Design a protein around this nucleic acid. Sequence first.
DNA 1: CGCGCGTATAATGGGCAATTGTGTG
DNA 2: CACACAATTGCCCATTATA
DNA 3: CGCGCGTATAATGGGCAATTGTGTG
DNA 4: CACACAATTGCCCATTATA
Lengths: 531, 531
Amino acid sequence: VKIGELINSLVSEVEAIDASDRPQGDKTKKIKAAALKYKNALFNDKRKFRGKGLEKRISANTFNSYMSRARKRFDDRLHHNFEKNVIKLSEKYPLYSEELSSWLSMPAASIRQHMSRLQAKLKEIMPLAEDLSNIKIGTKNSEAKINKLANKYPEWQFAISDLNSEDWKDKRDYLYKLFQQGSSLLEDLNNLKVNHEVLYHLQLSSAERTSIQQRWANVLSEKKRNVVVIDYPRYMQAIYDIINKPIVSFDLTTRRGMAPLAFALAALSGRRMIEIMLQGEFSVAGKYTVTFLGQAKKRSEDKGISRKIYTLCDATLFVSLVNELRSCPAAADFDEVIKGYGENDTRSENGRINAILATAFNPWVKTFLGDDRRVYKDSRAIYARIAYEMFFRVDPRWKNVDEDVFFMEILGHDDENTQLHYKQFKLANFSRTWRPNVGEENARLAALQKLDSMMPDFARGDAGVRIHETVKQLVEQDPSIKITNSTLRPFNFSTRLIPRYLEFAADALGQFVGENGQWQLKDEAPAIVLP
Amino acid sequence: VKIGELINSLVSEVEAIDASDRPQGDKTKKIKAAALKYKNALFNDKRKFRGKGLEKRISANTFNSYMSRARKRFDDRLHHNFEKNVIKLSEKYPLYSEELSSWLSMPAASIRQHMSRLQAKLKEIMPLAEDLSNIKIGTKNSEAKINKLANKYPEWQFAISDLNSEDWKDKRDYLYKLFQQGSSLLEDLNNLKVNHEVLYHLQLSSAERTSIQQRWANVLSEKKRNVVVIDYPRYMQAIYDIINKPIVSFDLTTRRGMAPLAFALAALSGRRMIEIMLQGEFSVAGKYTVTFLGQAKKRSEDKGISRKIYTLCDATLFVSLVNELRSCPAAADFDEVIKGYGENDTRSENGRINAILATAFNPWVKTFLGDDRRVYKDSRAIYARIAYEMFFRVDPRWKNVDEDVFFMEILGHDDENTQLHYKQFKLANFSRTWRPNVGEENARLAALQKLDSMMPDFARGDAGVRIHETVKQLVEQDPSIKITNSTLRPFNFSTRLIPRYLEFAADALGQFVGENGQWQLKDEAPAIVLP
DNA sequence: CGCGCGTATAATGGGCAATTGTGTG
DNA sequence: CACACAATTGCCCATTATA
DNA sequence: CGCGCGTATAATGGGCAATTGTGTG
DNA sequence: CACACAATTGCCCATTATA
């Protein structure tokens, strides 16, 4: 292609197509495996291993991203030696042959889910048995302890609660059979190979993995040692000012047009770009709380669970702006953008979206905030700080839980660990009591001071006031609009006259000429407080 | 032994002794390995695998703790196939034969340190090369970028800064040789087996490991969902009250005696018990800051680094109470306690200490705080909360770093991850302005109200006032002392008279009789605010 | 963002011997 | 005061739980 | 407490075509 | 007003960086 490094797509299929025949072949297992590895080194090298110069090969990041891609291409395919095996275990472990055997003819997509769920259940044997190996099996304290502990270990309540009942001894010895069997099953379920043989060769390499994993580890470390202070009210204000402009007030016929609004909605809820723009689903729950579904990045739990999240302004107004944005022109292509551009588009549907919006949104954001350094996804980091500083010590929801739990749940994380990435911001001038503004107008006022004063004589007759009147009218509308030569020509004023005016109204309009056209001097102190 | 489950010690050596001959033997490698595994299953089973009932075997926790022990018994011993190998790599990679070969005849204890340091250095190639593969090797911007990047990657500055200098091309191509060689070295250094062959069999088992690792994961999770609120001033006070009692004021001829003071010192600095009691080393640095050395639990960096830590009261007074405690009787056995009790004592020197102090301190702590549930090491959790609530937004030390960095550094952790265990407490009524108290005396005052009033006629002559006078004198001393029958007999008062008095002074002394002897009604609201 | 592993300390309870506590002869 | 008997301290270790 | 791994999103820049901007014929 | 030429928008993708 044009400025491409690797013809990726072709490559990726050059193998999914090859390794689909290699397993199709009449030859058998021993050699097939021998040829699969082959295929991979074919894939592997092409991208970053052999016959590659230096400043022309892709990066470790681009390498692992592409690997994920190839690997993912086999998701729906399990190890050749799998089923053969699952059977062997049914035979080997009876009390678990209903579940084990219920797998076989099932999609891989849900075997994996059934196996980890089972592994999870089995992994709880060790502790559960230790708890019992400390409980008087007699009817003295059994009733209590049992119904307390039994109700403490869900998928066992059926065999636990059945200890102190119509039966006793025999139903007990039963468990130990579920134990000694499930305990060694796990030992085998853990060792059991699941995903397709190829995957085991489509891995980076200790060398490559280790050094990436350390690099990343370093990047987020320097990050926690470099906080960026934000001015709460300035920020909050600028956001509220976006939310007000009537939906029509701004252009939405361009991908960039919906940047301000997109970033804002994201800045108020803390949801991820994709979540806002596409698969997120909200419904009001209170003035500042809204229920959410469609958390992204979940390695399929399968479940379409809902989490109650905070909203930094009327949650109703929020759900409507999201329903708005999702409609206006710029956002209608989505049902097609997703479908991709051909058999060589390896991106995900969500990825296809990112291909469009990301470039449209980030640039706006930098201007919006002042400095460049930070991006769109900062709305999360920001939001999470606010939500914290705003509701941790107040909402009786977190009475008995620590801050980490808070960041986790508010973010949708499956462990309090990943929220270590979301703490790069510090708030300067925060008040649980902040409120927006009604308004004033530096702009028109200034242009006014030079109203009639020098407008009848600024030109031959009328002109002087007709331009000024126009410019005023035009500013009163958008107290933040940039008046250029192109802004006034559509109105029909002597071309050699407009610029003559701008050079004049230069200070009242707050514009200066840079190394090109006319611009607007910086307004206030960009939410990002300098060092 | 008496109530022991496994004769551990014997066992552990029954093998270090066996597997020391197994490698001594004239037979060779192939079979030796065959026999080592053998040895292990001998160790392994004896503790938790075969020929073991159920409620009589040890726990997964006791199992992994004991494994650590056995493993650690080989620390100073490397793989048989190691040296053989290190050589092969010197040959294989020249530019790294000085370091690789400098290993060989060296203690294992420092080879391991030399290898991870080298691995670390090599793991930085990937990124460093990518940075360069984006730098104009010409003298246009080289000087700047290079001296910026070169000074950014330490053990490379020698070969990096030497790019834009007396030389150019040849010294560059040099790096790529350090790169292509170090890059594949790592790939091999990572795969290289280091520690003794046995270790690879003295492992738990996916089944066993996975389920422990999940259990633990669960225990700390329920923990972050169960915070314990502490009353800042009550707590702080009770602590300051301990610090004041002149060193002589309390018994230190018993291990328990030094509990109050030990817990207090720990409560003021946030250091670990062992750190306080034995290997910690402090020197004042300011009113509230002190420098510390001897951080425990570090898997030898080798380095005796010092970290500046906070102190919750005069850091000078602090360092003196630590120098005090470390002396008084109860703490002098330490130089011998450490040596152990024989060849069958598998504990660590620090462990040997824990064997003594832990039981002596925890019980005091529970009474001290009110409820039982929590222990000694809570001083850390507490401290870290205070230090946070106390200095995060104030000490200009953390201007550009997030809370996690704070907890980390204040704790001595090697990663902001482990500080997720130290957040179980929440402070109720915290003020950066708290101050102790001068004093009052409910006790004596009350006993006073019943002074002469009814003392001359409380008994036959004198007695009435002589006992009361004594009891008063005795309380004025210790406004918190428990007056029992034994407290007054050494003074020589009619035995059938003391109890007659206590039954009387019962309410002024604030004592009641429980299901045994006389006790003291609870004082205030134990620092642990109820739910 | 979601999934996994071996080590170095602190904490709990048992079985005794010493000391605190009560009556009372 | 001294003696008999009830509890509670205090100890150190082998287990067991946590960072 | 300290040490390790594969995936699902968001962010950056290039090469063009369209539109904003300036002079001015 | 219409035309020539300077910049800046706006786009979507293949890379590359982050959670």
